[model samples]
Target: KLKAVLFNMDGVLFNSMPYHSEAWHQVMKTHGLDLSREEAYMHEGRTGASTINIVFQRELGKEATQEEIESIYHEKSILFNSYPEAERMPGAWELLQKVKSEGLTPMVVTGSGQLSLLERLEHNFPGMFHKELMVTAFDVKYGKPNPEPYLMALKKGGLKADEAVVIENAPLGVEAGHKAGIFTIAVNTGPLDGQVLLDAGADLLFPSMQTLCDSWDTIML
Candidate 1:
């Protein structure tokens, strides 16, 4: 029996990945780094430091210093917030309602360190999340593709890996969830192709959050 459902925040809960992708591309460009749009999407579930370091390692042959990472991430955050706020994903709230109605605990496991996302969740999805049930950037030293975030979610939910289901939209998030030994479902809501998620080991794939919500009963069983 499933005891919990772990959700990835950016593309799964809110349609915010595009803004994030744009911000990442803009920031990297300002720094003279060459991160393609597709690369940004592939790095979606990585922490700012991790993402920055990857670029640094590739372009500079060195990892970024904490201060450098901080400065760049700060600039990126400003760019992100400057854009008009993103909306909740279609059918995301409805899916949360179904998870709750089925007596399954819903928890968030995200790579984002932004306080804005947290505050937005509290404001827009009130009574739907608990701080204790969240695994954000603060909670993990390693981000997606590492499994640390999803593993923490499993622990916080007081369930074994097999007792929880992971819902993600990023390829790295799908890989992370599967690495943590949980069954992973990927929703293709972003520009990345469905094959990316399937190759990352997602046990199931849906075209969108609305489609997943519509097939809840079939999925649950």
Candidate 2:
């Protein structure tokens, strides 16, 4: 039986990637780097530190120090929070209901650590998630594309890779899930093409939240 479904938070649960993308973009520019919103979307699954460090290495030929990473990520967070709260992704609630109705646990395995977002998980979808079954940026040293986040989620859920599935919108998130040895579903909720997800190793693909919710029954096995 499918014991659990690990869900990504950014584009998957909430339509918040735009804010994050913009935040990173603006901050990177102000800090003497360039990160397009689209590029930020592609870098979605990485931790803010990792993302900043990558930018540093790529453009400056060095990684950010702890202080630099903290300064940059904090700026991004403040900017992201200044934006209007992100709305729940349409059909996400329906999908969660379906997962719970089927007796499978709903788990959050995201690279985000926004207090605003985490609080909304419970406020927006009461009883849908337990803190224990969720994996956040704070919980993993290595972010998505490393497989550790998804792997830690399985450990927390006490599930096997075969018994769980990951639903993600970002390619890096999909890559993390797939590399963790679980079936990964890519929901194209961003600007990136579906091929990006496929190339990242998504086992299945859905065009949108509504489509994924509507097709849940067929794939939940």
Count steric clashes of candidate 2: 0
Each prediction's whole-model lDDT (CA):
0.91, 0.93
**Candidate 2, poorest ten consecutive residues by summed lDDT:** 212-221
Cα lDDT for residue 209, candidate 2: 89
Which candidate number would show the highest lDDT if scored against the true structure? 2
Alpha carbon lDDT of residue 73, candidate 1? 94
Flag clash pairs in model 2. none
**Model 2, range 1-221, lDDT digits (tens) per residue?**
79899999999999998899999999999998988999999999998889999999999999899999999989999999999899999999989998899899999998888999998899887789999999999999999989999999999999999999999999989999999999999999999999999999999999998999998888745
Give the per-residue Cα lDDT of candidate 2 at 118.
Answer: 92
Can you give the TM-score per candidate against the true fold? 0.97, 0.98
- After aligning candidate 2 to the native by TM-score, how far in Å is the CA of 182 from where it should be? 0.2
